[PDB]
Amino acid sequence: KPRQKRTATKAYNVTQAFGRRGPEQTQGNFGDQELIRQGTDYKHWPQIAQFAPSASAFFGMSRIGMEVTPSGTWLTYTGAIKLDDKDPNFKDQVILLNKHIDAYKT
């Protein structure tokens, strides 16, 4: 029920769990219409999930901060996950992620 622990599915999709996609700093930007509708039921979810960090890696790799704003107290995070450009699936992986980044603008 805490937002960060939700898992979107067709029965409880990306908008229900995580809000509409959009350009504001408080919004997620990732997902075309079918990923939004299907969440982890999406046809290529495992190929996306392979880039998501474990809890240990989330706190080990990221730059972590905290911010107390008018809306509340936030744990902030930024980081980058390196793709293997030698993987024979590398080009497909780039295509897959680009299909969903800022897809709401199309």
Add this chain to the structure above:
Amino acid sequence: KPRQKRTATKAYNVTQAFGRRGPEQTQGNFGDQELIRQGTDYKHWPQIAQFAPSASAFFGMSRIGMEVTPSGTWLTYTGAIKLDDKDPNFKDQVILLNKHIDAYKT
């Protein structure tokens, strides 16, 4: 094993998995000496892990990008996870995260 899927423990600690804490863009900044050396064996690891995102929430909550540089092709990410200041453990949660944020500077 791909870095984002690693789990640090006493036998394979945060440094071995995720590199030394530091100030640079490629470095994690989170963890005091105890957490670094113990990973998920750390005494308060569950109280930290409760803020890590599920794979679905990682891609649902974060602002996702991609960058190509001489150092590789990168999936970049940023976001903010709200704490519940109505939780009676809220203050101790803020204290715990603050203890580990940039602790390498102390």
